[PDB]
Each structure stands twice: as C-alpha cells, then as structure tokens.
C-alpha cells in the first residue's frame, strides 16, 4: 500500500507538473499575445493620430489650393 500510494501520488504530481508547464507556456503565450495586442493598440492610436494629422494636412492643402485658385482668378 505504501508503494501504491507513493506511485499514485507521484503520477498525479507528474500530471500536475506537466499541467504546470502547460499553464506556464499558456501564460507566456497569453503574455506575448497581450504585449502584441498592447503594442498594436499603441501603434493603432499613434497611427490614428498620424492619419488624422494627414487628412487635416490634405485639408489644409485643399484650402491653400482653393486660396490660390480664387487668388489667380482675382489676378486673371
């Protein structure tokens, strides 16, 4: 009974430790995916800032074009 109990608890602890490495790898994948998602959020925010700046620059250039169109029509 000693040997059976010891083998059983050792087997169950081995299943446990295998699960522990599985959780460790799963949590490392969770962490790497979380850092990826986090950097993607930060880059999405910076890119949305840059895109709003870009369309506002397109827009400023559009008013400069309309400005010069009405100005040349004034001269013309």
Nearest to 10 by CA among 21, 2, 22, 26: 2
Q: Which does 36 bind (CB under 5 to 8 A by kind): a second copy, another protein, none?
A: a second copy
Q: Tell me how far, at minimum, the Cβ of 3 lies from another protein, in Å.
A: 9
> Could you give the angle at the alpha carbon of 41 between the alpha carbons of 50 and 54, nearest 5°?
10
Rule CB under 8 A: say whether 43 interacts with a second copy: yes
Query: What is d(CA 7, CA 72) in angstroms, rounded to the nearest whole number?
Result: 94
- Site for a second copy, rule CB under 8 A: 1-2, 5, 8-9, 12-13, 15-16, 19-20, 22-23, 26-27, 29-30, 33-34, 36-37, 40-41, 43-44, 47-48, 51
């Amino acid at each position: 009974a000693d040997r059976e109990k010891t083998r059983a608890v050792q087997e169950l602890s081995e299943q446990n430790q295998r699960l522990l490495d599985q959780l460790s790898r799963a949590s490392e994948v969770e962490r790497q995916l979380s850092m990826q998602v986090h950097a993607l959020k930060e880059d999405f925010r910076e890119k949305n800032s840059s895109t709003n700046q870009h369309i506002i620059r397109l827009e400023s250039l559009q008013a400069e074009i309309k400005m010069l169109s009405d100005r040349k029509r004034e001269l013309e």
